[PDB]
Amino acid sequence: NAEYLEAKSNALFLKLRMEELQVLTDCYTPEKVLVHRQIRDTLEAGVKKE
Amino acid sequence: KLDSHLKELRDFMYPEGNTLMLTTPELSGEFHQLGSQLEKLNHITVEILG
Amino acid sequence: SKTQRALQKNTNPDTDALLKSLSDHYSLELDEMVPKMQRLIQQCEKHQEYG
Numbered sequence: 804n805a806e807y808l809e810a811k812s813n814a815l816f817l818k819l820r821m822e823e824l825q826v827l828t829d830c831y832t833p834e835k836v837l838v839h840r841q842i843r844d845t846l847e848a849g850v851k852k853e
Numbered sequence: 854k855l856d857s858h859l860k861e862l863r864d865f866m867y868p869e870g871n872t873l874m875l876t877t878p879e880l881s882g883e884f885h886q887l888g889s890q891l892e893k894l895n896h897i898t899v900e901i902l903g
Numbered sequence: 904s905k906t907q908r909a910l911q912k913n914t915n916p917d918t919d920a921l922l923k924s925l926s927d928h929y930s931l932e933l934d935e936m937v938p939k940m941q942r943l944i945q946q947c948e949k950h951q952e953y954g
Contacts, residue, residue: 804884805884805936805939805940808884808887808888808891808943809943811891812891812894812943812946812947812950815891815894815895815898815950816894816946816950816953818898818902819897819898819901819950819953819954820953822901822902858918861918861922862918862921862922865922865925865926877929877932877933877936877937879932879933879937880932880936880937880940883936883937883940883941883944884940886940886944887940887943887944887947890944890947890948890951891947893947893951894947894950894951894954897951897954898954901954
């Protein structure tokens with residue numbers, strides 16, 4: 804009973820972590836990462852000037 | 854001697870006097886609590902996947 | 904002599920040895936199994952926060 808509850812806990816957590824990482828890959832495509840870099844560099848230049 | 858051995862073994866097997874103790878009460882509580890927490894984690898996992 | 908022969912047939916395990924085995928088993932569940940379950944409870948709670 805202890806081993807079964809441990810295995811079920813671990814399987815539920817790994818399923819949750821897998822779906823999070825799949826959303827992150829769907830979010831951050833190479834084209835968007837390039838745009839996010841341009842936005843970052845424009846913001847950092849603004850923060851430094853101010 | 855027979856009366857003493859019977860009494861000592863009975864008191865160990867029936868600590869509340871009326872129920873045969875098969876599982877350690879502390880462990881039985883932890884099984885119920887882990888069961889409940891795992892049912893909550895399963896609900897959160899199903900909701901996010903939905 | 905009938906009673907002593909009946910005691911000798913029933914004596915594997917001896918009552919003191921059985922009480923000791925029962926006490927050792929009770930201690931093993933408290934020291935190893937209970938704190939394993941409590942760690943699994945705390946891990947489940949962290950996994951609910953990670954949700």
